[PDB]
């Protein structure tokens, strides 16, 4: 069902959005610190199958959050992702030849989610 997938994608994007907005603000002194970690994302993420690269970077995401309940949020996130692309490696994420900060990483995926939701029309 198109609506199931849309819902899941919305829930997923809102959790990511919660983290991004939650750490990327002037009331967080750890930011600079968090921006030194190199995150990996797809160069051109567009198919739901690409959610494999987000999945492969979740423990790293949970790790940066420790500098900011993460353990529960990431768990929720991870399940939704599996629900959106299964348990098989759906893509060979040797990733972009380029890296990213959590701000970019999250910007990519939040945009990915918002886009696919509209595309599902």
């Amino acid at each position: 069902s198109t609506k199931k997938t849309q819902l899941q994608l919305e829930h997923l994007l809102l959790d990511l959005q919660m983290i991004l907005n939650g750490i990327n603000n002037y009331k967080n002194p750890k930011l600079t610190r968090m921006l030194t970690f190199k995150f990996y994302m797809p160069k051109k993420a567009t198919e739901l199958k690409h959610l494999q690269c987000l999945e492969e970077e979740l423990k790293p995401l949970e790790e940066v959050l420790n500098l900011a309940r993460p353990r529960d949020l990431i768990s929720n996130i991870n399940v939704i992702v599996l629900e959106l692309k299964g348990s098989e490696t759906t893509f060979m994420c040797e990733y972009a030849d380029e890296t990213a900060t959590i701000v970019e990483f999250l910007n990519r995926w939040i945009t990915f989610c918002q886009s696919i939701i509209s595309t599902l029309t």
Binding site: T36, F37, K38, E56, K59, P60, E63, L67
Partner: protein
């Protein structure tokens, strides 16, 4: 529970800084050399807990912990309040002024800040 310092130690032109030992909680970015990314789904940093915790690992496209296929720029560290680094001019430069040349990340009223070293290295 150690607190991370919001900033890097003061930067002194032509000077480098070194910690003599690392405190419970300093983190070391698992950075890689050019043409090498970190192992898929791999840890982001090592953590001092006494010894280091995680293991860095770079594939291809506490005491000073031992190398791995590291980064040729340095190691990006994250210190905790109470930590001190020591400054010394690099080669080709001498201490013009030698006010305190070490820094401690202190947490005065809320925020953390490093003590300002007073070291000056002229050509």
């Amino acid at each position: 529970d150690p607190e991370l310092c919001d900033d890097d130690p003061p930067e002194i032109p032509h000077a480098t800084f070194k910690a003599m030992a690392y405190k419970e909680g300093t983190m070391l970015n698992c950075e890689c050399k050019r043409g090498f990314r970190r192992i898929k789904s791999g840890s982001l940093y090592m953590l001092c807990t006494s010894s280091w915790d995680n293991q860095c690992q770079c594939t291809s496209s506490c005491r000073e912990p031992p190398p791995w296929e590291n980064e040729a720029t340095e190691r990006i560290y994250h210190f905790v309040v109470g930590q001190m680094v020591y400054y010394q001019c690099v080669q080709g430069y001498r201490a013009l002024h030698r006010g305190p040349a070490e820094s401690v990340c202190k947490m005065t009223h809320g925020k953390t800040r490093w003590t300002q070293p007073q070291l000056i290295c002229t050509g």
